[PDB]
C-alpha cells in the first residue's frame, strides 16, 4: 500500500 510505503520511509523502516 502506498501510504504504508510513505509511513515506513519517514519512520526509517
Amino acid at each position, epitope marked *: *500500500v*502506498v*501510504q504504508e510505503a*510513505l509511513d515506513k*520511509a*519517514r519512520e526509517g523502516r
Partner: antibody
Amino acid sequence: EVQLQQSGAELVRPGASVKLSCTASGFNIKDDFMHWVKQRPEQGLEWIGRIDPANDNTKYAPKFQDKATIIADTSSNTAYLQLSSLTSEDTAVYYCARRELYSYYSPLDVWGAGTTVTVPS
Amino acid sequence: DIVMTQSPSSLTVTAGEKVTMSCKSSQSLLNSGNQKNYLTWYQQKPGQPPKLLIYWASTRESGVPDRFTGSGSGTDFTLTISSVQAEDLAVYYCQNDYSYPLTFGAGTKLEP
C-alpha cells in the same frame, strides 16, 4: 516557487540507452519520492516507477523493471531515468513528478514539462 | 493490478454546461487505516503535463477553481464541472494512488 526541469528532446537509435534528467528547483529532492511516467503518442499515462532519494529505495511497475532504472543525485538535486535496449515502442513523452513527504499524504502535485524520446522504426 | 475505467471516453461540451465524468476501480481504493480514498484527478491539455486537480477523491488542490468537484468512495468516483469554461478543454484522468503499481484511467476528453 517549486518546479521540475526536464532535459531536451532525445533522438536515439534502437539498441542504445538514454538517460533523462529531472532537476528540482525550490526544494530538495531528499524530501520527495521522485516518479517517472510514460505517455505514448495519443495514448494514456503509464507509471514507470519511483525512487526515494534519501535512501535510494526504488519501486517499479513490473512491465518496466527490465527497461528502466531510476536514480537520484542529491548533490545536483536531480532525478534520472535510464532506458536500456531502446526500441521504437519506447518512443513517448516521459514525465517526472514529485511526491513531497512533509504532509502525512500528498499526491503527485508537481510535474515536469516532459521529455520526448524518439526511437525510429 | 488495479484497472481504472473512465467513461465517457469523450464528451462534446459547450460553455456554461454542467458535465460529469465517471471513474471506476477494479478494487477498492479506500484505505481502511485512515478512511481516505486514494483517488486522484488530473487535467491534461495539449503539449502539457498532467495538472493535479483533486486528491483523496474530493480534496481540491489549492488554486483549482470551485467549479471542479470530486466525489465518490470505494470503487465509484466522479469528477463534476458545474459550468464548463473554454480553458477546461482537455483530457481528465483519474489515478489509483492506493497500491502499486500506480495506474491511470484512459481519461475522458472534453472536446469542442
